Design an enzyme around this catalytic site. Structure first.
Site, PDB file in Angstrom:
ATOM      1  N   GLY A 136      11.455 -12.803 -10.817  1.00  0.00           N
ATOM      2  CA  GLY A 136      10.035 -12.689 -11.134  1.00  0.00           C
ATOM      3  C   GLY A 136       9.536 -13.888 -11.917  1.00  0.00           C
ATOM      4  O   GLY A 136      10.261 -14.870 -12.093  1.00  0.00           O
ATOM      5  N   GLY A 143       6.665 -14.983 -15.322  1.00  0.00           N
ATOM      6  CA  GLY A 143       5.698 -14.647 -16.355  1.00  0.00           C
ATOM      7  C   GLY A 143       4.684 -15.742 -16.607  1.00  0.00           C
ATOM      8  O   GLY A 143       4.260 -16.441 -15.683  1.00  0.00           O
ATOM      9  N   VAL A 144       4.308 -15.890 -17.875  1.00  0.00           N
ATOM     10  CA  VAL A 144       3.204 -16.760 -18.277  1.00  0.00           C
ATOM     11  C   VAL A 144       3.542 -18.239 -18.135  1.00  0.00           C
ATOM     12  O   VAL A 144       2.673 -19.049 -17.808  1.00  0.00           O
ATOM     13  CB  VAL A 144       2.768 -16.504 -19.740  1.00  0.00           C
ATOM     14  CG1 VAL A 144       1.287 -16.812 -19.918  1.00  0.00           C
ATOM     15  CG2 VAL A 144       3.065 -15.075 -20.160  1.00  0.00           C
ATOM     16  N   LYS A 151      15.644 -20.068 -15.527  1.00  0.00           N
ATOM     17  CA  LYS A 151      14.187 -19.994 -15.649  1.00  0.00           C
ATOM     18  C   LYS A 151      13.565 -21.366 -15.423  1.00  0.00           C
ATOM     19  O   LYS A 151      13.963 -22.346 -16.053  1.00  0.00           O
ATOM     20  CB  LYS A 151      13.781 -19.440 -17.019  1.00  0.00           C
ATOM     21  CG  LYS A 151      12.275 -19.305 -17.208  1.00  0.00           C
ATOM     22  CD  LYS A 151      11.921 -18.491 -18.440  1.00  0.00           C
ATOM     23  CE  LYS A 151      10.456 -18.079 -18.400  1.00  0.00           C
ATOM     24  NZ  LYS A 151      10.109 -17.133 -19.494  1.00  0.00           N
ATOM     25  N   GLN A 160      22.517 -16.288 -19.916  1.00  0.00           N
ATOM     26  CA  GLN A 160      23.389 -15.308 -19.275  1.00  0.00           C
ATOM     27  C   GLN A 160      22.545 -14.229 -18.602  1.00  0.00           C
ATOM     28  O   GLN A 160      21.428 -13.942 -19.043  1.00  0.00           O
ATOM     29  CB  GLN A 160      24.398 -14.705 -20.269  1.00  0.00           C
ATOM     30  CG  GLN A 160      23.815 -14.158 -21.581  1.00  0.00           C
ATOM     31  CD  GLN A 160      23.734 -15.202 -22.694  1.00  0.00           C
ATOM     32  OE1 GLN A 160      23.195 -16.294 -22.505  1.00  0.00           O
ATOM     33  NE2 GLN A 160      24.259 -14.859 -23.866  1.00  0.00           N
ATOM     34  N   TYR A 161      23.073 -13.654 -17.524  1.00  0.00           N
ATOM     35  CA  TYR A 161      22.345 -12.649 -16.749  1.00  0.00           C
ATOM     36  C   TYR A 161      22.679 -11.244 -17.231  1.00  0.00           C
ATOM     37  O   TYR A 161      23.851 -10.878 -17.341  1.00  0.00           O
ATOM     38  CB  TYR A 161      22.646 -12.805 -15.253  1.00  0.00           C
ATOM     39  CG  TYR A 161      22.066 -11.725 -14.358  1.00  0.00           C
ATOM     40  CD1 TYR A 161      20.687 -11.599 -14.178  1.00  0.00           C
ATOM     41  CD2 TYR A 161      22.900 -10.844 -13.671  1.00  0.00           C
ATOM     42  CE1 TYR A 161      20.155 -10.612 -13.351  1.00  0.00           C
ATOM     43  CE2 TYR A 161      22.379  -9.854 -12.840  1.00  0.00           C
ATOM     44  CZ  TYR A 161      21.007  -9.746 -12.684  1.00  0.00           C
ATOM     45  OH  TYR A 161      20.486  -8.769 -11.864  1.00  0.00           O
ATOM     46  N   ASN A 207       5.989 -15.280 -28.479  1.00  0.00           N
ATOM     47  CA  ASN A 207       5.765 -14.418 -27.313  1.00  0.00           C
ATOM     48  C   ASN A 207       6.601 -13.137 -27.373  1.00  0.00           C
ATOM     49  O   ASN A 207       7.107 -12.674 -26.354  1.00  0.00           O
ATOM     50  CB  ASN A 207       6.060 -15.186 -26.011  1.00  0.00           C
ATOM     51  CG  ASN A 207       5.566 -14.461 -24.752  1.00  0.00           C
ATOM     52  OD1 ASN A 207       4.997 -13.368 -24.814  1.00  0.00           O
ATOM     53  ND2 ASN A 207       5.786 -15.085 -23.600  1.00  0.00           N
TER      54      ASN A 207
HETATM   55  N1  LIG Z   1      18.783 -13.163 -18.878  1.00  0.00           N
HETATM   56  C1  LIG Z   1      18.123 -12.356 -18.016  1.00  0.00           C
HETATM   57  N2  LIG Z   1      18.781 -11.432 -17.276  1.00  0.00           N
HETATM   58  C2  LIG Z   1      18.137 -10.621 -16.413  1.00  0.00           C
HETATM   59  N3  LIG Z   1      16.806 -10.662 -16.214  1.00  0.00           N
HETATM   60  C3  LIG Z   1      16.025 -11.542 -16.891  1.00  0.00           C
HETATM   61  C4  LIG Z   1      16.654 -12.461 -17.853  1.00  0.00           C
HETATM   62  N4  LIG Z   1      15.671 -13.212 -18.378  1.00  0.00           N
HETATM   63  C5  LIG Z   1      14.510 -12.812 -17.800  1.00  0.00           C
HETATM   64  N5  LIG Z   1      14.722 -11.816 -16.917  1.00  0.00           N
HETATM   65  C6  LIG Z   1      13.697 -11.131 -16.096  1.00  0.00           C
HETATM   66  O1  LIG Z   1      12.988 -12.064 -15.277  1.00  0.00           O
HETATM   67  C7  LIG Z   1      11.647 -11.598 -15.070  1.00  0.00           C
HETATM   68  C8  LIG Z   1      10.625 -12.711 -15.296  1.00  0.00           C
HETATM   69  O2  LIG Z   1      10.818 -13.335 -16.570  1.00  0.00           O
HETATM   70  P1  LIG Z   1       9.628 -14.151 -17.292  1.00  0.00           P
HETATM   71  O3  LIG Z   1       9.282 -15.357 -16.450  1.00  0.00           O
HETATM   72  O4  LIG Z   1      10.002 -14.333 -18.744  1.00  0.00           O
HETATM   73  O5  LIG Z   1       8.382 -13.139 -17.206  1.00  0.00           O
HETATM   74  P2  LIG Z   1       8.256 -11.836 -18.140  1.00  0.00           P
HETATM   75  O6  LIG Z   1       9.442 -11.786 -19.077  1.00  0.00           O
HETATM   76  O7  LIG Z   1       8.023 -10.655 -17.226  1.00  0.00           O
HETATM   77  N6  LIG Z   1       6.813 -12.082 -19.087  1.00  0.00           N
HETATM   78  P3  LIG Z   1       6.746 -13.499 -20.107  1.00  0.00           P
HETATM   79  O8  LIG Z   1       8.065 -13.517 -20.841  1.00  0.00           O
HETATM   80  O9  LIG Z   1       5.553 -13.252 -20.996  1.00  0.00           O
HETATM   81  O10 LIG Z   1       6.572 -14.656 -19.155  1.00  0.00           O
HETATM   82  C9  LIG Z   1      11.431 -10.420 -16.013  1.00  0.00           C
HETATM   83  O11 LIG Z   1      11.443  -9.209 -15.242  1.00  0.00           O
HETATM   84  C10 LIG Z   1      12.628 -10.468 -16.946  1.00  0.00           C
HETATM   85  O12 LIG Z   1      13.038  -9.173 -17.402  1.00  0.00           O
HETATM   86 MG   LIG Z   2      10.016 -13.049 -20.294  1.00  0.00          MG
END
Ligand SMILES: Nc1ncnc2c1ncn2[C@@H]1O[C@H](COP(=O)(O)OP(=O)(O)NP(=O)(O)O)[C@@H](O)[C@H]1O
Ligand SMILES: [Mg+2]
EC number: 2.7.10.1
Length: 268
Positions: A18, A20-21, A44, A87-88, A133
């Site tokens: 996914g 986010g911001v 990311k 880490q995941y 955040n």
């Molecule tokens: N280390 C991780 N392991 C598993 N899932 C992750 C991890 N880091 C982020 N995610 C997931 O990746 C998705 C997108 O992350 P992200 O780009 O940070 O958007 P967000 O967390 O939904 N909102 P924001 O943090 O405000 O941008 C989210 O559903 C997170 O829960």
């Molecule tokens: Mg996030």
């Protein structure tokens, strides 16, 4: 005070999770040192919208941090886009967790998370790191009982540009100013999210209106499962004066104090 640099040929992206911001999170693998190995990682992707070639001093600041309750940045990969590698955590978000299981969760177990989050934010406060955040989406499950704060300081990687607004302190909205104290506010809305089993903050209201409502001092509603004692903890986080808002030290105290006798302070 150092951060690992990952060669582009070490990281491989498998699936997108996914976005986010600021970035886009991808489930991926890490293959170090030529010889085959397969370490599950989360990558990311952050871009300008100029280039991320070159490591900034703030990138190292993020890289250095390590605590039992934060999500550690294992490494960094510069390029046209910045690639943050952590880490995941298959168990995923605390937000989507409380939604799915809700009240079924332990009143004891749910308090521990308030404590665990505060301990992490304390660690960040100690090393002078402003998260900027904090939210339930950003708290992640390392273990069925263990949580870690994620996404700290990502905002300060990008030039001042422009919904986190439901999580911002009033002075952050007004002055674009972020402090350790401003995060304390965000911690408040977070704890709130949890106590409401993942309810959306300021639901069904216009964003332009939001500064007005809390400025009028109506603030967030009392969550169904919270006694006035746990609710006031949150209320102090949203005090207009920051120098009267609680420190993460004290927040770790109040919750751990309640954790001793769980059902006295929360109820199904
Ligand atoms: N280390 C991780 N392991 C598993 N899932 C992750 C991890 N880091 C982020 N995610 C997931 O990746 C998705 C997108 O992350 P992200 O780009 O940070 O958007 P967000 O967390 O939904 N909102 P924001 O943090 O405000 O941008 C989210 O559903 C997170 O829960
Ligand atoms: Mg996030």
């Amino acid at each position: 005070v150092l951060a690992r640099i990952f060669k582009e040929t070490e990281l491989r992206k498998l699936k997108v999770l996914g976005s986010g911001v600021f970035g886009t999170v991808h489930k991926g693998v890490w293959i170090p040192e030529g010889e085959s190995i397969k370490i599950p990682v989360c990558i990311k992707v952050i871009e300008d919208k100029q280039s991320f070639q070159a490591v900034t001093d703030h990138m190292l600041a993020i890289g250095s941090l390590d605590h039992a309750h934060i999500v550690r940045l294992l490494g960094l990969c510069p390029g046209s886009s910045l690639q943050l590698v952590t880490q995941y955590l298959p168990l995923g978000s605390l937000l989507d967790h409380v939604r799915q299981h809700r009240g079924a969760l332990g009143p004891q177990l749910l308090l521990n998370w308030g404590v665990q989050i505060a301990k992490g934010m304390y660690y960040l406060e100690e090393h002078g790191m402003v998260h900027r955040n904090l939210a339930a989406r950003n708290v992640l499950l390392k273990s069925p009982s263990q949580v870690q704060v994620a996404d700290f300081g990502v905002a300060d990687l990008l030039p001042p540009d422009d919904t986190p607004i439901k999580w911002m302190a009033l002075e952050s909205i007004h002055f674009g100013k972020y402090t350790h104290q401003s995060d304390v506010w965000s911690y408040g809305v977070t704890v709130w999210e949890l106590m409401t089993f993942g309810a959306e903050p300021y639901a069904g209201l216009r964003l332009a209106e939001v500064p007005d409502l809390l400025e009028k001092g109506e603030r967030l509603a009392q969550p169904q499962i919270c006694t006035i004692d746990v609710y006031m903890v949150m209320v102090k986080c949203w005090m207009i004066d920051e120098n009267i808002r609680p420190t993460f030290k004290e927040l770790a105290n109040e919750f751990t104090r309640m954790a001793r006798d769980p059902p006295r302070y929360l109820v199904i």
